[PDB]
Paper text:
The N-terminal 23 residues preceding the TM1 of [name] were replaced by the [name] domain. Importantly, wild-type [name] or [name]-[name] overexpressed in HEK293F cells exhibited comparable transport activity for a standard substrate [3H]-radiolabeled methotrexate ([3H]-MTX), indicating that the [name]-tag would not affect the normal function of [name]. We purified the [name]-[name] protein and then added anti-[name] Fab and [name] (Nb) to assemble the [name]-[name]/Fab/Nb ternary complex. The cryo-EM map of the ternary complex was collected and successfully reconstructed to 3.6 Å resolution. In the structure of [name]-[name], the last helix of [name] rotated around its joint region with the TM1 of [name], and as a result, the four-helical bundle of [name] resided parallel to the cell membrane. A notable feature was that a segment of TM1 (Ile41–Phe47) was unwound in the extracellular leaflet of the membrane. It has been documented that the discontinuity of TM helices could play pivotal roles in transporters and ion channels by creating substrate-binding sites or providing flexible gating hinges. On the other hand, the EM densities of the intracellular loop between TM6 and TM7 (residues 214–249) and the C-terminal cytoplasmic region (residues 452–591) of [name] were invisible, implicating their high motility and in line with their dispensable role for the transporter function.
In contrast, [name] is ubiquitously expressed in the body and represents the major system of folate transport in diverse cell types. Notably, [name] functions as an antiporter, i.e., coupling folate intake with the transport of another substrate in the opposite direction. Human [name] has 591 residues with a molecular weight of 65 kDa and is mainly composed of 12 TM helices. To overcome this issue, we exploited the [name]/Fab/Nb module, which helped provide the apparent shape for particle alignment.
Numbering used by the authors:
A (entry chain H): 4 to 228
B (entry chain L): 2 to 213
C (entry chain N): 1 to 120
D (entry chain A): -82 to 213, 250 to 451
């Protein structure tokens, strides 16, 4: 089968440079033109640029005009998207899609075989470990029924971090929220479980986080006051 | 250059409900539009091309219709696989690719009142230098619930920070975690700290508060 | 300055049908959402249903899902409530509610007086 | 909006591309070109509609729009690179491929002007107003009483007897063989006028001339059946201007042949027959449309008609249309006999029917242009204005009905032109208070019923007045009784007004 793959994405600085590779396995780039589609995290799809390797008529979007550039090589069967002076708005997932040439049926077919898409981010903050803080149920009031018990992790970079409860034991009632972007550049995430009040003073609950780039493993305890 | 609007941005139906998604162009774009299905996390896929034809690979329960500048997708029997985000994209030239906004379908489910909980910061944030109170809304539907963070009986704005989660696979309900972060001025202000949140399943908005 | 006018009522047999009605005067309705609440003697301030707009659906509660019916007429500014198969555990007073937000967050300010419903 | 609206906005957009600089806004122009080109690719054209789809003679349409959209791509890929004259060169190549590939399946691109070319050459009849001096002249040797009491009543009865079938036949055969029959009827009129021997030849001539004046409604309905409904206003305006220009040019040509050129009446009718042969040759080359009116149901028309039957300003104008049309045509059918009686000169150049016809056409065009601008409310000012117009008509008919001195015939001519104004001031206005209330099928039905009852009343008055076995009155007492009739109408509308 024919498909696409994207490489060269990671973390950069604002005002830096980054080159992205779009490799098409199967078909050649002289028989189908290539396109770039931006998807901000939480927003929808939006278009960036294209290239047609037959003639070359590269036109850009209004937000990336005169800042990005594109160049496709048919010997290596790939397309390079070079970006310099990156703004903070360009933190997004880039998809590299195929689309056919006029005339015929492959023009009326849309972007049929999308790629997996790479992730690019523009941030000024550096990498650090998540500070973990407990969230006690405050059992002096609102007792009798169920209660909640939480962990607030904050001030970490980059994105991926995992939060587990009792090293994977307590997994029925775990709500892990997505990482929301704090205005100071870092990230803050919350996690919480539902514990009945009868066992809340009996079972000792621990809370283990795992941050893979900044290799720290903070395993704290969560208990009421 | 041209706009491509898409009105039913938040749908909700059950397994076996016919749903319609409209999409309105600005210019007189011909019968060349695309409907895309994107699972949460994965890549979008071609579902409908040229506003009437079905792509080889997707089942016969997807269709489309052109009426002037109005493109309408219709799903007859809603498969549980078909809970994803559907995008509208007019294609007319190489450099006039303008997507829509996106329609996220949901599961039709009863309205449950949120279990509104509040968490003050621990003993470590008062020694670190940045305190953070949070308010949790668990097991509620739909997503829209507005918290206001009544501090000193006033609507604090610009300092709150919300984060909703995805839909649960066990009971199809939602959770929300609003996070009000402050400096060491959590102490020398007024001792009451409340969050008032409202919801359609709530008669009066639930106000959860703590002192000191 | 807006107001709600509800109707209905009547001693009914267990298993009958009824048509509750709620109209509004003071403000147009087609850019808002309306809702139905319940108050039983012994409890307080429960939920029945909510009708959002003309392009969305009606959302019900845990005990009235698939049993009652909610219709909305924006040309007459009236939301109905087709009660079907009334169990005797719903002897209560039904409240009508207007929304005060276009994002249907749940800002409810103006309610009605209510309507007595009694079984057997 | 199948192919023609997209094609006209494509032509207008290509003109916009042609006459513009500062190429930031030619990208929207080229993408609207592309949208209008891709919208018409699956258009299924009407001359191809009779052929089966997926045929090898159909793919030329798709291949022509394929190379059209390809050159739109070649134009738009250079418009984004800052080039401003290469887009013009690609537009010229687009023009060449437009002339090559697409225009074979388009119908015709002079369908306005050719109808203008039919609105002129089919109206050049320079012996139209000179029929009556050709009858009373030394050529055919007819008397005044035989042409007064016998020939034109046959015209009236024949106009009824061809207003009955030929309107349905006009709405039936899609309007092209009906205009061909009208041209052949004009040919028959001038052949019976040339080769006439006695009264019965002229009676058959008046039968065919009644066919010609009854087929006058065919032209505007042919325009409505040919032209798309969103282009009907401008093309109908050009066609009405062409018809008025043709009638005025015909009357001016009649004056330039009879008076200035000193051409005899037989040679004048020869030239008239030549122009009618040109009219027949041009009528043979008319395209037959498909969408008729009463054949392309009845309860829906009755339901849409009954909502405005008791509406005011529709029944009074209908009765006025009937009465004033009967009186107006009974004055027009005898004004030439009256002019030949008052001025019985043997000189052919002394006859000035063509100058009065040209002045009548000019004043009718002026009072028709000055009719849509009449913004007078009709709640109280209806019967007073109609009473004043009928009083002016009665005064002019009474002015014509007493002049027996020869040298005052000049004072007759333009005076009757004023009478020719006095009806034409209220021809669109009576349309404007009838046609602006119902649907187009109901409009054609109401005007057909009004013209039919107008012809009934005209036939009854012709049976009373000009009967060969009843009264048999001379045309002087005929104009006197017509002045009495217009005076009775003036009394009726004055009693209705105040």
């Amino acid at each position: 089968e024919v498909q696409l793959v994207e490489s060269g994405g990671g973390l950069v600085q604002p005002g830096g440079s980054l080159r992205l590779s779009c490799a098409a396995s199967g078909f050649n780039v002289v028989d189908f033109s290539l396109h770039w589609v931006r998807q901000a995290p939480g927003k929808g799809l939006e278009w960036v640029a294209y290239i047609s390797s037959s003639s070359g008529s590269t036109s850009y979007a209004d937000s990336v005009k005169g800042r990005f550039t594109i160049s496709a090589d048919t010997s290596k069967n790939t397309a390079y998207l070079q970006m310099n002076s990156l703004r903070a708005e360009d933190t997004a997932v880039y998809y590299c899609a195929r689309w056919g040439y006029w005339p015929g049926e492959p023009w009326w077919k849309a972007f049929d075989y999308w790629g997996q898409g790479t992730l690019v981010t523009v941030s000024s903050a550096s990498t650090k470990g998540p500070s973990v803080f407990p969230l006690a149920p405050s059992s002096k009031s609102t007792s009798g029924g169920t209660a909640a018990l939480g962990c607030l992790v904050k001030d970490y970079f980059p994105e991926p971090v995992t939060v587990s409860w009792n090293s994977g034991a307590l997994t029925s009632g775990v709500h892990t929220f997505p990482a929301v972007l704090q205005s100071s550049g870092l990230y803050s995430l919350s996690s919480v479980v539902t514990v009945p009040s009868s066992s809340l003073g009996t079972q000792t609950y621990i809370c283990n986080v795992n941050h893979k780039p900044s290799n720290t493993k903070v395993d704290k305890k969560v208990e009421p006051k | 250059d041209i706009q491509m609007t898409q009105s039913p941005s938040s749908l909700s139906a059950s397994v076996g409900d016919r749903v319609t998604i409209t999409c309105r162009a600005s210019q007189s774009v011909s019968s060349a539009v695309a409907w895309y299905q994107q699972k949460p996390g994965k890549a979008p896929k071609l579902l409908i091309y040229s506003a009437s034809s079905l792509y080889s690979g997707v089942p016969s329960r997807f269709s489309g219709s052109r009426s002037g500048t109005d493109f309408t997708l219709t799903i007859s029997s809603l498969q549980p696989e078909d809970f994803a985000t559907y995008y509208c994209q007019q294609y007319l030239y190489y450099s006039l690719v303008t997507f829509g906004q996106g329609t996220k379908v949901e599961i039709k489910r009863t309205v449950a009142a949120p279990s509104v909980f509040i968490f003050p910061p621990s003993d470590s944030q008062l020694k670190s230098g940045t305190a953070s109170v949070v308010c949790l809304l668990n097991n509620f539907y739909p997503r829209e619930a507005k918290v206001q963070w009544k501090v000193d009986n006033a609507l604090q704005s610009g300092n709150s920070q919300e984060s909703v989660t995805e839909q649960d696979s066990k009971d199809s309900t939602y959770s929300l975690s609003s996070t009000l972060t402050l400096s060491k001025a959590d102490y020398e202000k007024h001792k009451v700290y409340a969050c008032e949140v409202t919801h359609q399943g709530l008669s009066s908005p639930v106000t959860k508060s703590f002192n000191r | 300055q807006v107001q709600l006018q509800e109707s209905g009522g009547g001693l009914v047999q267990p298993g009958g049908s009824l048509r509750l009605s709620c109209a509004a005067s003071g403000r147009t309705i087609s850019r808002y959402a309306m809702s139905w609440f319940r108050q039983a003697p012994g409890k307080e301030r429960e939920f029945v249903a909510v009708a959002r707009r003309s392009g969305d659906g009606a959302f019900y509660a845990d005990s009235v899902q698939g049993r009652f019916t909610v219709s909305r007429d924006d040309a007459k500014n009236t939301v109905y409530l087709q009660m079907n198969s009334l169990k005797p555990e719903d002897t209560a007073v039904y409240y009508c509610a207007i929304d005060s937000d276009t994002f249907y967050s749940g800002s409810y300010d103006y309610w009605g007086q209510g309507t007595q419903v009694t079984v057997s | 909006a199948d192919l023609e609206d997209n094609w006209e906005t494509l032509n207008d957009n290509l003109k916009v591309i042609e006459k513009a600089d500062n190429a930031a806004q030619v990208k929207d122009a080229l993408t609207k070109m592309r949208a209008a080109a891709l919208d018409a690719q699956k258009a299924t054209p009407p001359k191809l509609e009779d052929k089966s789809p997926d045929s090898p003679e159909m793919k030329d349409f798709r291949h022509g729009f394929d190379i059209l959209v390809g050159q739109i791509d070649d134009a738009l890929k250079l418009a984004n690179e800052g080039k401003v004259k290469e887009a013009q060169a690609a537009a010229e190549q687009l023009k060449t491929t437009r002339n090559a590939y697409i225009q074979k399946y388009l119908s015709w691109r002079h369908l306005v002007c050719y109808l203008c070319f039919y609105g002129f050459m089919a109206q050049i009849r320079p012996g139209e107003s000179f029929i009556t001096p050709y009858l009373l002249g030394p050529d055919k040797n007819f008397t005044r009483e035989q042409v007064t009491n016998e020939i034109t009543p046959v015209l009236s009865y024949s106009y009824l007897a061809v207003l009955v079938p030929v309107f349905l036949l006009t709405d039936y055969l899609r309007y092209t063989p009906v205009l061909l029959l009208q041209g052949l009827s004009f040919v028959s009129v001038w052949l019976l006028l040339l080769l006439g021997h006695s009264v019965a030849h002229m009676q058959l001539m008046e039968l065919f001339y009644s066919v010609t004046m009854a087929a006058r409604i065919a032209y505007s309905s042919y325009i409505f059946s040919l032209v798309r409904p969103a282009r009907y206003q401008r093309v109908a305006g050009y066609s009405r201007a062409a018809v008025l220009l043709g009638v005025f040019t015909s009357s001016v040509l009649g004056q330039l042949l009879v008076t200035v050129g000193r051409v005899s009446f037989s040679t004048l009718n020869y030239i008239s027959l030549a122009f009618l042969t040109f009219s027949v040759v041009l009528a043979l080359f008319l395209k037959r449309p498909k969408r008729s009116l009463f054949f392309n149901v009845l309860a829906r028309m009755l339901r849409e008609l009954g909502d405005s039957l008791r509406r005011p300003q529709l029944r009074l104008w209908s009765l006025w249309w009937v009465f004033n049309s009967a009186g107006y045509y009974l004055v027009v059918y005898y004004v030439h006999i009256l002019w030949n009686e008052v001025d019985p000169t043997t000189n052919s150049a002394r006859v000035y029917n063509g100058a009065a016809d040209a002045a009548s056409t000019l004043l009718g065009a002026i009072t028709s242009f000055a009719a849509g601008f009449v913004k007078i409310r009709w709640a109280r000012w209806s019967k007073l204005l109609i009473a004043g117009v009928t009083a002016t008509q009665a005064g002019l008919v009474f002015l014509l009905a007493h002049t027996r001195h020869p040298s005052s015939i000049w004072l007759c001519y333009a005076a009757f032109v004023l009478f020719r104004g006095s009806y034409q001031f209220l021809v669109p206005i009576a349309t404007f208070q009838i046609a602006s209330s119902l649907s187009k099928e109901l409009c054609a039905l109401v005007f057909g019923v009004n013209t039919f009852f107008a012809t009934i009343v005209k036939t009854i008055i012709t049976f009373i007045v000009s009967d060969v076995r009843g009264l048999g009155l001379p045309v002087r007492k005929q104009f006197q009784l017509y002045s009495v009739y217009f005076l009775i109408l003036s009394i009726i509308y004055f009693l209705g007004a105040m």
